[PDB]
Amino acid sequence: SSVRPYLEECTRRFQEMFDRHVVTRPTKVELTDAELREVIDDCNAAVAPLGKTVSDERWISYVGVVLWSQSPRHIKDMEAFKAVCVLNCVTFVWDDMDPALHDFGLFLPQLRKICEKYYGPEDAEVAYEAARAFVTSDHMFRDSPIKAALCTTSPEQYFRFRVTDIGVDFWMKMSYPIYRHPEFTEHAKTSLAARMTTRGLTIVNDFYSYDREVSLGQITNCFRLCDVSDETAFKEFFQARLDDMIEDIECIKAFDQLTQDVFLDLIYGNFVWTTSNK
Amino acid sequence: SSVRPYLEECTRRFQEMFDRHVVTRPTKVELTDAELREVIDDCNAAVAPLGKTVSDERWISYVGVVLWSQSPRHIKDMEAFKAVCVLNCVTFVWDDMDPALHDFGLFLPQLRKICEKYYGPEDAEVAYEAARAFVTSDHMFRDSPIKAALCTTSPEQYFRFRVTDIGVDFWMKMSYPIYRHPEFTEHAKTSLAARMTTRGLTIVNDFYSYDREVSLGQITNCFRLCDVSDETAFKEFFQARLDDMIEDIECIKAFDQLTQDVFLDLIYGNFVWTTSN
Ligand SMILES: [Cl-]
Ligand SMILES: [Mg+2]
Ligand SMILES: [Mg+2]
Ligand SMILES: [Mg+2]
Structure with missing residues (x-):
């Protein structure tokens, strides 16, 4: 099965919702050539002990979510920003990887090295723990009865799983040093940040990765909760997910102005990067 | 307004739900008189810097939730257990205290000192960070526009707020060394533990503290999302919450056996303790 018959309409309705409810467009962080080579050098060094060879073009496609979904107005710490670039990219490679090749004894110390390089001592512990928790979660739930139960029961349980499994809690806990904003x-x-942005990130990511994931037999996708071959059922389910995104976006505007900018930029920026060609 | 007309029926239906879906009864951890005195002295020392004397009796009514809602058969570390007894009690008094007497500079070192007595170096930092985040969240959100929005929009937004605000995540992150169970x-x-148990704990807590909290102008209660004065609206809302608890409980049974016993003892033990003295 496939969502191809809805690809155009659903793209348009996503963009329309964002135009009406966030308004402010995402903007791409521009890395200098120096910064980008430093980032790729760190990514390559981190995945070397696993024997993987990742092309520059691969790294650049991974890092685009960070470039598009941070909040450049409010950036204060570019060392922290580069850390997110590197930690996002190497996690991508680890999540795109045959779990038989998952060597935690080789990978975990590379994550600690990245955090220790770019963050202060306190922030390095926080960022590293979320990274460790993320990759341990991913490993723990491949073919776990819990994943099947949370992903097939209801939209509420699935998004409850996804707070961690889509990596947004990780993302928040390595991204707050970028902004040094106390409330954020x-x-x-507390993970309230991740809980507020999880659905908007996951619904978008799930729609544009449905065809690929179901072809690989993966179940971590909310559109498996409806009959995507029944246009009527799909339209109702998609409107419900838009209704979730909107409700979350409206409550996000009750947060302070900087924090709200970061959350909405993350959701809206993630949609731009996902629907972009590179 | 009051949920008093529904107290007996809802208590019975809560109990019925647990007998049907959890079956296994909660059991009370009993502390030796030495163990309990150790707990209380620590509690007293932690709150003296704030000028607070607290009776043994009041400490014991606070600690009851720990004695009832942990999982006695799986306990392996009683020092961790006493830490939870203490951290729970002193955060109780910090929650029921005037936000003007909130001296973060005096209290946070006492929390750290408790975690350092009872936990290993690594577990101390985890328990301490969750305690810090809880009391800081509690301070951030009094009179916060965020709290107003999250508690009045939808049950989903409300329970999302309570994952932290009712302290489950704190509870999970200071309780795991009690069990030394890797999956748990x-x-x-990851806070999946807190996410799975938030609604079961919150719905029961909200029902039985509704009258007190609404009479105090507090809005952190799912039952203000419905008209408790309309019996038909209240019954419908209550059944919706019962359905939430049942779905979570049925999903919890997919976890490994030890973890799910801990999760279910927590939710069921909380109900028992809530409805006791
Ligand atoms: Cl930590
Ligand atoms: Mg995907
Ligand atoms: Mg409170
Ligand atoms: Mg209450």
Whole structure:
């Protein structure tokens, strides 16, 4: 099965919702050539002990979500920004990888090295723990009865799983040092930040990765909760997910102005990057 | 307004739900008089810097939730257990205290000192960070526009707020060393543990503290999302919450056996303790 018959309409309705409810467009962080080579050098060094060879073009496609989905107005720490670039990219490679090749003894110390290079001592522990928790979660739930139960029961249980499994809690806990904004720092550490952005990130990511994931037999996708071959059922389910995104976006506007900018930029920027060609 | 007309029926239906879906009864951890005195002295020392004397009796009514809602058969570390007894009690008094007497500079070192007595170096930092985040969240959100939005929009937004605000995540992150169970430790550190148990704990807590909290102008209660004065609207809302608890409980049974016993003892033990003295 496939969502191809809805690809155009659903893209348009996503963009329309964002135009009406966030308005402010995402903007791409521009890395200098120096910064980008430093980032790729770190990514390559981190995945070397696993024997993987990743092309420059691969790294650049991975890093685009960070370039598009941070909040450049509010950036204060570019060392922290580069850390997110590197941690996002190497996690991507680890999640795109045959779990038989998952060597935690070789990979985990490379994650700690990245965090220790770019963050202060306190922030390095926070960022590293979320990274460790993410990759351990991913490993723990491949072919787990829990994943099947949470992903097939209801939209609520699936998104409850996805708070961690899509990596947004990880993302928040390594991204707050970029902004040094006290309120945002707390929302990141309570995971309220991740809970507020999970659905908008996951619904978008799920729609544009449905065809690929179901072809590989993966179940971590909310559109498996409806009959995508029944146009009527699909339209109702898609409107419900838009209704979730909107509700979340409206409550996000009750947060302080910087924090709200970061959340909405993350959701809206993730849609731009996902629907972009590179 | 009041949920008093529904107290007996809802209590019976809560109990019925647990007998049908959890079956296994919660059991009370009993502390030796030495163990309990150790807990209380620590509690007292932690809150003295704030000028607070607290009776043994009041400490014991606070600690009851820990004695009832942990999973006695799986306990392996009683030092960790006493830490939870203490951290729970002193955060109770910090929650029921005037936000003007909130001295973060005095209290946070006492929390750290508790975690350092009872936990290993690594577990101390985890328990301490969750305690810090809880009391800081509690301070951030009094009179916060965010709290107003999250508690009045939808049940989903409300329970999303309570994952932290009712302290489950804190509870999970200071309780996992009690059990030394690797799956539970991960489920607690990702907060999936708190996410699975938030609604079961919140709905029961909200029902039985509704009258007190609404009379105090507090809005952190799912039952203000419905008209409790309209029996038909209240019954419908209550059944919706019962359905939430049943779905979570049925999903919890997919976790490994030890983890799910901990999750279910927590939710069921909380109900028992809530409805007791
Ligand atoms: Cl930590
Ligand atoms: Mg995907
Ligand atoms: Mg409170
Ligand atoms: Mg209450």
